[PDB]
Coordinates of C-alpha atoms (C1' of nucleotides) in Angstrom, one line a residue:
Chain A
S111 CA 25.9 -26.4 16.4
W112 CA 22.7 -26.7 14.4
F113 CA 20.6 -26.8 17.7
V114 CA 22.5 -23.7 18.7
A115 CA 22.1 -21.9 15.3
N116 CA 18.4 -22.6 15.1
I117 CA 17.7 -21.5 18.6
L118 CA 19.6 -18.3 17.8
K119 CA 17.4 -17.7 14.7
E120 CA 15.0 -19.7 12.6
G121 CA 16.5 -20.9 9.4
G122 CA 20.0 -20.6 11.0
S123 CA 23.1 -22.5 10.0
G124 CA 25.4 -24.7 12.1
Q125 CA 28.9 -26.0 11.8
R126 CA 29.9 -28.3 9.0
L127 CA 32.2 -31.2 8.5
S128 CA 35.3 -30.4 6.3
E129 CA 36.0 -31.7 2.8
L130 CA 39.7 -31.7 3.5
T131 CA 40.2 -33.2 7.0
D132 CA 37.0 -35.0 8.0
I133 CA 36.7 -37.8 5.4
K134 CA 38.8 -41.0 5.7
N135 CA 41.6 -41.0 3.1
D136 CA 41.4 -44.8 2.6
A137 CA 37.6 -44.6 2.1
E138 CA 36.0 -45.6 -1.2
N139 CA 32.8 -43.6 -0.6
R140 CA 34.6 -40.2 -0.5
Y141 CA 32.1 -38.8 2.0
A142 CA 31.6 -38.8 5.7
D143 CA 28.3 -39.1 7.6
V144 CA 27.9 -38.3 11.3
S145 CA 24.5 -39.7 12.0
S146 CA 23.0 -39.0 15.5
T147 CA 19.9 -39.4 17.5
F148 CA 18.8 -37.4 20.5
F149 CA 16.0 -37.9 23.0
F150 CA 13.8 -35.3 24.6
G151 CA 11.2 -37.4 26.4
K152 CA 8.2 -39.5 25.6
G153 CA 6.9 -36.9 23.2
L154 CA 10.1 -36.6 21.1
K155 CA 11.7 -39.9 21.9
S156 CA 13.8 -39.7 18.7
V157 CA 15.3 -36.6 17.2
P158 CA 17.5 -37.7 14.3
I159 CA 20.3 -35.6 12.7
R160 CA 22.9 -36.3 10.1
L161 CA 25.8 -34.0 9.4
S162 CA 27.2 -35.3 6.1
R163 CA 29.8 -33.9 3.9
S164 CA 31.4 -35.1 0.6
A165 CA 35.0 -35.0 -0.3
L166 CA 36.5 -32.0 -2.1
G167 CA 36.5 -32.5 -5.8
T168 CA 34.0 -35.3 -6.0
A169 CA 30.9 -34.4 -8.1
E170 CA 28.4 -35.9 -5.6
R171 CA 27.2 -33.7 -2.8
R172 CA 25.7 -35.2 0.4
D173 CA 22.8 -33.3 1.9
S174 CA 22.6 -33.1 5.7
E175 CA 19.4 -34.0 7.6
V176 CA 19.2 -31.3 10.2
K177 CA 15.5 -30.6 9.8
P178 CA 14.4 -32.4 13.0
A179 CA 17.0 -30.2 14.8
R180 CA 15.5 -27.2 13.1
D181 CA 12.0 -28.3 14.4
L182 CA 13.0 -28.9 18.0
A183 CA 15.0 -25.7 18.2
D184 CA 12.0 -23.9 16.6
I185 CA 9.9 -25.2 19.5
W186 CA 12.5 -24.1 22.0
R187 CA 12.9 -20.6 20.6
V188 CA 9.2 -19.8 19.8
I189 CA 8.0 -21.1 23.2
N190 CA 10.8 -19.0 24.9
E191 CA 9.7 -15.9 23.1
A192 CA 6.0 -16.3 23.9
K193 CA 6.8 -17.0 27.5
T194 CA 10.2 -17.4 29.2
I195 CA 11.6 -20.9 29.4
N196 CA 14.9 -22.6 30.2
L197 CA 17.1 -23.4 27.2
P198 CA 19.6 -26.2 26.8
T199 CA 23.3 -25.6 27.4
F200 CA 25.8 -26.7 24.7
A201 CA 29.5 -26.5 25.3
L202 CA 32.8 -27.8 23.8
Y203 CA 35.9 -27.7 25.9
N204 CA 38.7 -29.2 23.9
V205 CA 42.5 -28.7 24.2
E206 CA 42.1 -25.1 23.0
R207 CA 40.8 -24.0 26.4
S208 CA 44.4 -23.8 27.5
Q209 CA 45.6 -20.4 26.5
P210 CA 47.4 -17.4 28.1
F211 CA 45.2 -15.1 30.1
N212 CA 45.8 -12.2 27.7
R213 CA 44.9 -8.7 28.8
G220 CA 27.9 -8.3 22.5
Chain B
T42 CA 18.0 -1.4 -26.4
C43 CA 20.3 1.6 -25.7
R44 CA 22.6 -0.5 -23.5
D45 CA 19.4 -1.5 -21.6
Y46 CA 18.5 2.2 -21.3
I47 CA 21.6 2.9 -19.1
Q48 CA 23.7 5.0 -21.4
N62 CA 17.3 8.3 -17.5
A63 CA 18.3 9.4 -14.1
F64 CA 19.9 7.1 -11.5
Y65 CA 19.4 8.2 -7.9
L66 CA 17.8 7.6 -4.5
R67 CA 14.2 8.7 -3.7
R68 CA 13.2 7.7 -0.2
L69 CA 14.7 6.2 3.0
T70 CA 12.6 4.6 5.8
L71 CA 14.3 3.6 9.0
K72 CA 12.2 1.7 11.6
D73 CA 13.6 0.9 15.0
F74 CA 17.1 1.5 13.7
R75 CA 19.6 3.5 15.9
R76 CA 17.1 5.6 17.9
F77 CA 14.9 6.0 14.7
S78 CA 11.6 4.6 15.9
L79 CA 10.2 5.4 12.4
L80 CA 11.8 8.1 10.2
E81 CA 11.1 8.5 6.5
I82 CA 13.2 10.9 4.4
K83 CA 12.6 12.1 0.9
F84 CA 15.7 13.0 -1.1
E85 CA 16.3 15.3 -4.1
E86 CA 17.8 14.1 -7.3
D87 CA 20.4 16.9 -7.2
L88 CA 21.4 17.7 -3.6
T89 CA 19.9 17.0 -0.2
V90 CA 21.4 18.6 2.9
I91 CA 20.6 17.4 6.5
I92 CA 21.0 19.8 9.4
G93 CA 20.0 20.0 13.1
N94 CA 22.4 17.5 14.6
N95 CA 26.2 17.6 14.9
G96 CA 26.4 14.4 13.0
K97 CA 25.0 11.7 15.3
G98 CA 21.7 11.0 13.6
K99 CA 23.0 12.3 10.3
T100 CA 25.9 9.8 10.5
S101 CA 23.3 7.1 11.1
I102 CA 21.4 8.2 8.0
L103 CA 24.5 8.3 5.8
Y104 CA 25.6 4.9 7.3
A105 CA 22.3 3.4 6.4
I106 CA 22.5 4.8 2.9
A107 CA 26.1 3.4 2.7
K108 CA 24.9 0.0 3.8
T109 CA 22.2 0.1 1.2
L110 CA 24.7 1.2 -1.5
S111 CA 27.1 -1.6 -0.5
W112 CA 24.7 -4.1 -1.9
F113 CA 24.7 -2.4 -5.3
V114 CA 28.5 -2.4 -5.1
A115 CA 28.7 -6.1 -4.1
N116 CA 26.5 -7.2 -6.9
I117 CA 28.0 -5.0 -9.6
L118 CA 31.5 -6.4 -8.6
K119 CA 30.7 -10.1 -8.0
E120 CA 27.7 -12.2 -9.1
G121 CA 25.6 -13.1 -6.1
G122 CA 27.7 -10.6 -4.0
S123 CA 26.2 -10.1 -0.5
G124 CA 26.9 -6.5 0.4
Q125 CA 27.2 -5.3 4.0
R126 CA 24.5 -6.4 6.4
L127 CA 23.1 -4.7 9.4
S128 CA 24.4 -5.6 12.9
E129 CA 22.4 -7.3 15.5
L130 CA 24.4 -5.5 18.2
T131 CA 24.4 -1.8 17.1
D132 CA 21.9 -1.3 14.2
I133 CA 18.8 -2.1 16.2
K134 CA 17.0 0.3 18.5
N135 CA 17.7 -1.0 22.1
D136 CA 14.1 -0.2 23.2
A137 CA 11.8 -1.6 20.5
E138 CA 8.9 -3.9 21.1
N139 CA 9.4 -5.0 17.5
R140 CA 12.8 -6.5 18.3
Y141 CA 13.9 -6.0 14.7
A142 CA 15.3 -3.0 12.7
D143 CA 14.4 -2.3 9.0
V144 CA 16.3 0.1 6.7
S145 CA 14.1 0.4 3.6
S146 CA 15.0 2.6 0.7
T147 CA 13.6 3.3 -2.8
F148 CA 15.6 4.2 -5.9
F149 CA 14.7 5.7 -9.2
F150 CA 16.6 4.6 -12.4
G151 CA 15.2 6.2 -15.5
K152 CA 11.7 6.1 -17.0
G153 CA 11.8 2.3 -16.8
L154 CA 12.2 0.9 -13.3
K155 CA 11.1 4.1 -11.6
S156 CA 11.0 2.3 -8.2
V157 CA 13.7 -0.1 -7.2
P158 CA 13.1 -1.0 -3.5
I159 CA 15.4 -2.4 -0.9
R160 CA 15.2 -3.4 2.7
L161 CA 18.0 -4.3 5.1
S162 CA 16.5 -6.1 8.0
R163 CA 18.0 -7.4 11.2
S164 CA 16.3 -9.1 14.2
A165 CA 17.7 -9.7 17.6
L166 CA 18.9 -13.2 18.6
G167 CA 16.0 -15.4 19.8
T168 CA 13.2 -14.2 17.6
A169 CA 10.7 -16.5 15.9
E170 CA 10.8 -15.1 12.4
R171 CA 14.2 -14.4 10.9
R172 CA 13.4 -10.8 9.9
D173 CA 15.3 -10.8 6.6
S174 CA 16.6 -8.2 4.2
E175 CA 14.7 -8.1 0.9
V176 CA 17.4 -7.2 -1.5
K177 CA 16.2 -9.1 -4.6
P178 CA 15.3 -6.1 -6.9
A179 CA 18.4 -4.1 -6.1
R180 CA 20.4 -7.2 -6.7
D181 CA 18.6 -7.7 -10.0
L182 CA 19.4 -4.1 -11.1
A183 CA 23.1 -4.5 -10.0
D184 CA 23.3 -7.8 -11.9
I185 CA 21.9 -6.0 -15.0
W186 CA 24.6 -3.4 -14.6
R187 CA 27.3 -6.1 -14.2
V188 CA 26.1 -8.2 -17.1
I189 CA 25.6 -5.4 -19.6
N190 CA 29.0 -4.0 -18.6
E191 CA 30.7 -7.3 -19.2
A192 CA 29.0 -7.6 -22.6
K193 CA 29.9 -4.0 -23.5
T194 CA 31.6 -1.3 -21.6
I195 CA 29.0 1.0 -19.8
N196 CA 29.6 3.8 -17.4
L197 CA 28.5 2.8 -13.9
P198 CA 27.4 4.6 -10.7
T199 CA 30.0 6.1 -8.5
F200 CA 29.0 5.6 -4.9
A201 CA 31.2 7.1 -2.2
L202 CA 31.1 8.0 1.5
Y203 CA 33.2 10.7 3.2
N204 CA 32.9 11.1 7.0
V205 CA 35.1 13.1 9.4
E206 CA 37.6 10.3 9.1
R207 CA 38.9 11.7 5.8
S208 CA 40.9 14.2 7.9
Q209 CA 43.8 11.7 7.9
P210 CA 47.5 12.5 7.4
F211 CA 49.2 11.8 4.1
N218 CA 50.6 -2.1 -6.6
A219 CA 49.6 -1.6 -10.2
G220 CA 47.2 -4.5 -10.0
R221 CA 45.0 -3.0 -7.3
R222 CA 45.2 0.6 -8.4
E223 CA 45.1 0.7 -12.2
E224 CA 42.6 -2.0 -13.1
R225 CA 39.0 -0.8 -13.6
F226 CA 36.5 -1.7 -10.7
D227 CA 39.2 -0.7 -8.2
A228 CA 37.0 2.5 -8.0
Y229 CA 34.7 0.5 -5.7
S230 CA 37.4 -0.6 -3.3
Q231 CA 36.8 1.1 0.1
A232 CA 34.5 3.5 -1.9
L233 CA 32.1 3.5 1.0
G234 CA 33.0 3.2 4.7
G235 CA 34.4 6.7 5.1
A236 CA 37.8 8.3 4.4
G237 CA 38.7 8.0 0.7
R238 CA 41.8 6.2 -0.5
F239 CA 43.9 9.2 -1.2
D240 CA 47.1 7.1 -1.1
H241 CA 45.6 5.0 -3.9
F242 CA 44.9 8.2 -5.8
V243 CA 48.5 9.3 -5.3
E244 CA 49.9 6.0 -6.6
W245 CA 47.4 6.0 -9.5
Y246 CA 48.3 9.5 -10.5
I247 CA 52.0 8.7 -10.5
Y248 CA 51.3 5.6 -12.6
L249 CA 49.3 7.7 -15.1
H250 CA 52.2 10.2 -15.3
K251 CA 54.5 7.2 -16.0
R252 CA 52.2 6.0 -18.7
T253 CA 52.0 9.3 -20.5
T310 CA 43.4 7.5 -22.8
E311 CA 45.4 8.0 -19.6
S312 CA 46.3 11.5 -20.7
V313 CA 42.8 12.7 -20.8
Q314 CA 42.1 11.2 -17.4
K315 CA 45.1 13.0 -16.0
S316 CA 43.9 16.3 -17.5
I317 CA 40.3 15.8 -16.2
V318 CA 41.6 15.2 -12.6
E319 CA 44.0 18.2 -12.9
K320 CA 41.2 20.6 -14.0
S321 CA 38.8 19.1 -11.4
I322 CA 41.0 19.8 -8.4
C323 CA 42.3 23.0 -9.9
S324 CA 38.8 24.4 -10.2
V325 CA 37.0 23.0 -7.1
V326 CA 39.9 23.8 -4.8
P327 CA 40.6 27.6 -4.6
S328 CA 44.1 27.6 -3.3
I329 CA 45.5 24.9 -5.6
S330 CA 46.2 26.2 -9.1
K331 CA 48.3 23.4 -10.6
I332 CA 49.3 19.8 -10.0
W333 CA 52.0 17.6 -11.4
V334 CA 54.7 15.1 -10.4
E335 CA 58.5 15.4 -10.5
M336 CA 60.1 12.2 -11.6
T337 CA 63.3 12.6 -9.6
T338 CA 65.5 9.5 -9.9
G339 CA 64.7 7.4 -6.8
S340 CA 61.7 9.4 -5.5
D341 CA 58.7 10.5 -7.5
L342 CA 56.9 13.5 -5.8
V343 CA 53.4 14.9 -6.3
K344 CA 53.5 18.7 -6.3
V345 CA 50.9 21.5 -6.4
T346 CA 51.1 25.3 -6.7
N347 CA 49.4 26.4 -3.5
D348 CA 49.1 30.2 -3.4
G349 CA 51.9 30.3 -6.0
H350 CA 54.2 28.1 -3.9
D351 CA 55.4 24.9 -5.5
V352 CA 54.9 22.5 -2.6
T353 CA 54.3 18.8 -1.9
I354 CA 51.0 17.4 -0.5
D355 CA 52.6 17.0 2.9
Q356 CA 53.0 20.8 3.0
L357 CA 49.3 21.7 2.3
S358 CA 47.1 22.8 5.2
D359 CA 44.7 20.4 6.9
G360 CA 41.6 21.8 5.1
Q361 CA 43.4 22.2 1.8
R362 CA 44.7 18.7 1.6
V363 CA 41.6 17.1 3.1
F364 CA 39.4 18.7 0.5
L365 CA 42.0 17.8 -2.2
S366 CA 41.8 14.2 -1.0
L367 CA 38.0 14.1 -1.1
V368 CA 37.8 15.6 -4.6
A369 CA 40.7 13.7 -6.0
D370 CA 39.4 10.3 -4.7
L371 CA 36.0 11.1 -6.1
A372 CA 37.3 12.2 -9.4
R373 CA 39.6 9.1 -9.8
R374 CA 36.6 6.9 -9.0
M375 CA 34.5 8.6 -11.6
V376 CA 37.3 8.5 -14.2
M377 CA 37.7 4.8 -13.9
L378 CA 33.9 4.2 -13.6
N379 CA 33.0 6.5 -16.5
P380 CA 35.6 5.7 -19.2
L381 CA 33.1 6.4 -22.0
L382 CA 31.9 9.9 -21.0
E383 CA 33.4 12.9 -22.7
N384 CA 33.6 14.4 -19.2
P385 CA 34.0 11.5 -16.8
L386 CA 33.1 13.8 -13.9
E387 CA 29.5 14.0 -15.1
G388 CA 28.7 10.3 -14.4
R389 CA 26.0 9.3 -12.1
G390 CA 26.3 8.3 -8.4
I391 CA 25.3 9.0 -4.9
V392 CA 28.0 10.7 -2.8
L393 CA 27.5 11.1 0.9
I394 CA 29.6 13.8 2.6
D395 CA 29.4 14.4 6.4
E396 CA 30.3 18.0 7.3
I397 CA 31.2 19.5 3.9
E398 CA 32.5 22.5 5.8
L399 CA 35.3 20.6 7.6
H400 CA 38.5 22.7 8.0
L401 CA 37.1 25.3 5.7
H402 CA 36.9 29.1 6.0
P403 CA 33.8 31.2 5.3
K404 CA 35.0 32.2 1.8
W405 CA 35.5 28.5 0.8
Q406 CA 32.2 27.6 2.5
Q407 CA 30.5 30.1 0.2
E408 CA 31.7 28.2 -2.9
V409 CA 32.1 24.5 -1.9
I410 CA 28.7 23.4 -3.2
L411 CA 28.8 25.6 -6.3
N412 CA 32.1 24.1 -7.3
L413 CA 31.0 20.6 -6.5
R414 CA 27.9 20.9 -8.6
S415 CA 29.9 22.5 -11.4
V416 CA 32.5 19.8 -11.7
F417 CA 30.0 16.9 -11.3
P418 CA 27.0 18.0 -13.4
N419 CA 25.0 14.8 -13.1
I420 CA 25.4 13.3 -9.6
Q421 CA 23.5 13.3 -6.3
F422 CA 25.0 14.7 -3.2
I423 CA 23.7 13.9 0.3
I424 CA 25.8 16.2 2.5
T425 CA 25.4 17.3 6.1
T426 CA 26.4 20.7 7.4
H427 CA 26.1 23.2 10.2
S428 CA 27.3 26.4 8.5
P429 CA 24.9 29.2 7.4
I430 CA 27.2 30.2 4.6
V431 CA 26.8 26.7 3.1
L432 CA 23.0 26.8 3.3
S433 CA 23.0 30.3 1.7
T434 CA 24.0 28.5 -1.5
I435 CA 21.3 25.8 -1.5
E436 CA 17.6 25.9 -2.2
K437 CA 15.3 25.5 0.8
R438 CA 13.6 22.5 -0.8
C439 CA 16.9 20.6 -0.5
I440 CA 17.2 21.1 3.3
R441 CA 16.0 18.6 5.9
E442 CA 15.7 20.0 9.5
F443 CA 16.1 17.8 12.6
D444 CA 14.1 19.2 15.5
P445 CA 16.0 20.2 18.6
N446 CA 13.5 17.9 20.5
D447 CA 14.3 14.8 18.4
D448 CA 13.8 12.8 21.6
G449 CA 10.2 12.7 20.5
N450 CA 11.1 10.7 17.4
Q451 CA 9.6 12.3 14.3
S452 CA 8.5 10.6 11.2
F453 CA 9.5 13.3 8.7
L454 CA 12.2 16.0 8.0
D455 CA 10.5 19.2 6.9
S456 CA 12.3 21.8 4.8
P457 CA 12.9 25.2 6.4
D458 CA 10.1 27.7 6.1
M459 CA 12.5 30.5 5.2
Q460 CA 14.2 30.6 1.8
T461 CA 18.0 30.1 2.2
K462 CA 19.5 30.3 -1.2
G463 CA 20.6 33.9 -2.0
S464 CA 19.7 35.0 1.5
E465 CA 21.7 36.7 4.3
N466 CA 24.0 34.3 6.1
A467 CA 22.9 36.2 9.2
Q468 CA 19.2 35.6 8.6
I469 CA 19.8 31.9 7.8
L470 CA 21.8 31.6 11.1
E471 CA 19.1 33.5 13.1
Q472 CA 16.1 31.5 11.8
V473 CA 17.2 28.2 10.3
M474 CA 19.6 27.5 13.2
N475 CA 18.3 29.8 16.0
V476 CA 21.7 31.7 16.5
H477 CA 21.5 35.4 17.2
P478 CA 23.5 37.8 15.0
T479 CA 25.4 38.9 18.1
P480 CA 26.3 36.7 21.0
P481 CA 24.4 37.2 24.3
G482 CA 27.4 36.4 26.4
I483 CA 28.9 39.8 25.6
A484 CA 27.2 42.7 27.4
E485 CA 28.2 45.2 24.6
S486 CA 26.4 42.8 22.2
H487 CA 23.1 43.9 23.7
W488 CA 24.0 47.6 24.0
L489 CA 22.6 48.7 20.6
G490 CA 19.3 46.9 21.1
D491 CA 18.9 48.3 24.6
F492 CA 19.4 51.8 23.1
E493 CA 16.4 51.3 20.9
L494 CA 14.1 50.4 23.8
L495 CA 15.5 53.3 25.9
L496 CA 14.8 55.8 23.1
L497 CA 11.2 54.6 22.9
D498 CA 10.8 54.8 26.7
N499 CA 11.5 58.6 26.9
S500 CA 8.9 59.5 24.2
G501 CA 11.5 59.0 21.5
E502 CA 13.9 61.5 23.0
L503 CA 17.3 61.3 24.6
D504 CA 17.8 61.3 28.4
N505 CA 20.9 60.6 30.6
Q506 CA 20.7 56.8 30.2
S507 CA 20.3 56.8 26.4
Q508 CA 23.1 59.4 26.1
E509 CA 25.4 57.3 28.2
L510 CA 24.6 54.2 26.2
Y511 CA 25.2 56.2 23.0
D512 CA 28.6 57.3 24.3
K513 CA 29.5 53.8 25.3
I514 CA 28.6 52.5 21.8
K515 CA 30.6 55.3 20.2
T516 CA 33.7 54.6 22.4
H517 CA 33.6 50.8 22.0
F518 CA 32.6 50.1 18.4
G519 CA 34.1 53.3 17.0
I520 CA 33.0 56.4 15.1
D521 CA 32.2 54.7 11.8
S522 CA 30.8 51.7 13.6
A523 CA 27.7 50.3 11.9
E524 CA 26.2 50.2 15.4
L525 CA 26.8 53.9 15.9
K526 CA 25.4 54.7 12.4
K527 CA 22.2 52.8 13.2
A528 CA 22.0 54.5 16.6
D529 CA 22.2 57.8 14.9
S530 CA 19.5 56.8 12.4
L531 CA 17.3 55.6 15.3
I532 CA 17.6 58.9 17.2
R533 CA 17.0 60.9 14.0
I534 CA 13.9 58.9 13.2
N535 CA 12.5 59.3 16.7
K536 CA 13.2 63.0 16.8
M537 CA 11.4 63.4 13.5
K538 CA 8.6 61.4 15.0
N539 CA 8.3 63.8 17.9
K540 CA 8.6 66.9 15.6
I541 CA 5.9 65.7 13.3
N542 CA 3.7 64.8 16.2
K543 CA 4.0 68.4 17.5
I544 CA 3.4 69.7 14.0
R545 CA 0.4 67.4 13.7
Chain C
rU1 C1' 16.9 -50.6 39.8
rA2 C1' 15.7 -49.4 34.9
rG3 C1' 13.4 -49.9 30.4
rU4 C1' 10.1 -52.8 28.0
rC5 C1' 5.3 -56.3 26.7
rG6 C1' 0.0 -55.2 27.5
rG7 C1' -4.8 -58.6 31.3
rG8 C1' -8.4 -56.3 33.6
rU9 C1' -10.5 -51.3 36.3
rG10 C1' -11.1 -46.1 34.7
rA11 C1' -11.9 -42.9 30.6
rU12 C1' -5.9 -41.3 25.5
rU13 C1' -4.4 -39.8 32.1
rA14 C1' -4.3 -42.0 36.6
rG15 C1' -4.0 -47.1 38.8
rC16 C1' -4.1 -52.7 40.2
rC17 C1' -2.4 -57.7 38.4
rA18 C1' 0.9 -60.6 35.8
rG19 C1' 5.1 -61.2 33.5
rA20 C1' 9.9 -61.7 30.4
rC21 C1' 15.6 -58.6 30.0
rU22 C1' 21.2 -60.9 22.7
rC23 C1' 25.5 -53.9 24.9
rU24 C1' 20.7 -52.9 21.9
rA25 C1' 12.8 -49.2 19.7
rA26 C1' 12.6 -44.9 17.7
rC27 C1' 4.5 -46.2 16.3
rU28 C1' 6.1 -44.0 10.5
rU29 C1' 2.6 -41.8 4.5
rA30 C1' -2.2 -40.1 1.1
rU31 C1' -6.0 -39.3 -2.9
rU32 C1' -1.4 -43.8 -5.3
rG33 C1' -0.6 -49.2 -4.1
rA34 C1' -1.8 -53.3 -1.4
rA35 C1' -4.7 -55.2 3.1
rC36 C1' -9.4 -53.9 6.5
rG37 C1' -14.1 -52.3 6.7
rU38 C1' -18.2 -50.1 4.8
rA39 C1' -21.5 -49.8 1.6
Chain D
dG1 C1' 16.4 -30.1 -8.1
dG2 C1' 17.0 -26.2 -5.8
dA3 C1' 15.2 -19.6 -5.0
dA4 C1' 16.7 -15.9 -1.4
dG5 C1' 19.3 -14.8 1.9
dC6 C1' 22.5 -16.0 5.2
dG7 C1' 26.4 -17.9 7.3
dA8 C1' 30.4 -21.6 7.7
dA9 C1' 35.0 -22.7 6.0
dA10 C1' 38.8 -21.5 3.9
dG11 C1' 42.2 -18.7 1.8
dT12 C1' 44.7 -14.3 0.7
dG13 C1' 45.7 -9.4 1.5
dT14 C1' 46.0 -5.1 4.6
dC15 C1' 48.0 -2.7 7.7
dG16 C1' 49.1 -1.1 12.5
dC17 C1' 52.7 -1.9 15.6
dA18 C1' 57.2 -3.0 16.8
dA19 C1' 62.3 -3.6 15.9
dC20 C1' 66.0 -1.7 14.2
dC21 C1' 69.1 1.2 11.5
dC22 C1' 71.4 5.7 10.2
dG23 C1' 72.3 10.2 9.9
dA24 C1' 72.1 14.7 12.7
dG25 C1' 72.8 17.8 16.8
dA26 C1' 74.2 20.4 21.2
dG27 C1' 77.8 20.1 23.2
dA28 C1' 81.0 16.1 27.7
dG29 C1' 84.8 17.9 30.6
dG30 C1' 88.3 18.1 30.9
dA31 C1' 93.2 19.2 26.9
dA32 C1' 91.0 20.4 20.8
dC33 C1' 87.3 18.3 19.2
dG34 C1' 83.4 16.8 21.2
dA35 C1' 81.4 10.5 24.7
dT36 C1' 76.9 10.2 25.1
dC37 C1' 72.0 11.0 25.0
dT38 C1' 68.5 12.2 22.2
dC39 C1' 65.4 13.6 17.4
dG40 C1' 63.7 12.4 13.5
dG41 C1' 63.0 9.4 8.5
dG42 C1' 62.8 5.3 7.0
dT43 C1' 63.0 0.1 6.1
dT44 C1' 61.6 -4.5 7.2
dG45 C1' 59.1 -8.2 9.9
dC46 C1' 54.9 -10.1 11.6
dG47 C1' 50.9 -11.6 12.9
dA48 C1' 45.7 -10.1 13.8
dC49 C1' 42.2 -9.4 11.6
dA50 C1' 39.5 -8.0 6.9
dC51 C1' 38.0 -9.1 2.9
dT52 C1' 37.1 -12.7 -1.2
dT53 C1' 35.3 -17.0 -2.4
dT54 C1' 32.7 -21.3 -2.5
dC55 C1' 29.2 -24.5 -0.3
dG56 C1' 25.2 -25.5 1.3
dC57 C1' 21.0 -25.0 4.0
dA58 C1' 15.8 -25.9 1.6
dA59 C1' 11.2 -22.0 -0.2
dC60 C1' 8.1 -23.9 -4.5
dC61 C1' 5.1 -27.7 -6.2
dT62 C1' -1.1 -26.4 -16.2
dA63 C1' -1.7 -31.9 -15.4
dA64 C1' -4.9 -35.0 -7.9
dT65 C1' -8.7 -36.2 -5.2
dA66 C1' -12.1 -35.6 -2.2
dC67 C1' -16.6 -42.7 2.7
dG68 C1' -13.5 -44.1 7.2
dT69 C1' -9.0 -46.9 8.9
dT70 C1' -3.9 -49.2 8.7
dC71 C1' 1.0 -49.5 6.0
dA72 C1' 5.2 -48.3 2.8

RNA sequence: UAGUCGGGUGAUUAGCCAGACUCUAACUUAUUGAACGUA
DNA sequence: GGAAGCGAAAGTGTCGCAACCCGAGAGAGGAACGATCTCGGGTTGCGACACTTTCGCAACCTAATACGTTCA
């Protein structure tokens, strides 16, 4: 979601873990950390990200390291503006895609 | 400080719109008292009032809540579809007293996929609104009364969310006023009876601004409390009033209630400051009411700014030409300014205003008889200022159609007399 | 197969030789600070 | 640590829209007085949004230094 937000607009904002339903209840840290690393070739062989969130009520935030995502998405967006390029597709099809066919 | 020099005018000065809703670049100056926009039926003028309402929403958001983020522009509608810039800016300057004579604001919005996040610059307006909020919290201070009233106010007609101060800003912008909230608030005031003076102020307000209405009260019948007025001497309910009568009553009563809650420390809470936008002040009104709407509005609200659109010559006949802002009929060639009419309008003939300011002839051209009188003139001048068969027939037609006392017939008689005297003196000279 | 280590040619590329493969590289930060040089 | 502005995440409130009731009302169809069918106000339910709130991203760097590399 941060890739998507920062290709939509520089300085954008992406989705965030929850301080009510995303941190293990038995945990002693009282914060969750989704670290990740992407790859985009020899140039950017490692694109780290870390979506971290502390537990509601604990007086210790946990910053998120999305800056490399900001940087790579900045490249995508700026280069697309200057000249047209092909952007990366991001999708999530969970169980919610089952819904009645009700009738930007 | 005298409440931080607040209790000094408080109004809007300028509005720039760049690549925003067909406005390639349009700068508008606004008068401290009253500005009126004409030329369009309310397409670009609605855009102007909508932009001003978006700007005022930030003042409201920050006076209500600390850090409040008022309404933002929309990436989907509030950006000119054809703009190499690919962003839209709505800049606006304000003037608040001798100190802080220029409070700027910009609401910016860039399309999706642009390198720089073209961003609103609302810091100074937020700072002023925070000054308002803080000094009010420390000590009570009368606050601005922003409002908007579009054609949506023509709509048919909880103590916590109607009696508590700062409810005056709830849905204050966005269009149609909350007249149902006013009805409930007025019934609550009547139940309570400071509330007394507020009731009296609202009563006098809508009794004086609205010609038909002459009194207002509520009957406390057990099980149903009704709001009643004396419309043309008839004791009726609000549901009985005509469309124009009740629509204007709702406008004025919503505004007055907002000002009464916002301006508790004024001796006349109707003289508090604000910026009220009113699309089509002439809605559902008849010429006689048109000829007094603005006089009454300015009388009951001595110190307040009105940005009101209009398309009625009778309305303009009561407003100085400086206050008027003309859209050109060829606005497709986007223009950067709105020039005042060359002709003076205040105190002028409604017919002259209609003919020149709006380019509408005093008599319709679809009616053949409408041209008759004028034709007669030419015909008289064709035959050396003397009658012939054609002019005599035209005179007979005018006399038959318009009547014997007809102003047209009197003017035809004057024309023939003047031309005959012309010929007689030419012979004598 | 793939990645990887990096001996020469050619000139951060290309390209010829070797090789090895715990599920499993991703080359970093300057003026501090070590270490290299240089003066 | 965090400005300025913006948006995510979450929670609460608004408010159409529907469902349903409860009198009226012209008058079956033939037996008087009027079944049914409607016209309305009006109350309650009910969920889709609309607004309110908090969190959190990360600008900035009176006090350095100024041969070239490497490395935290």
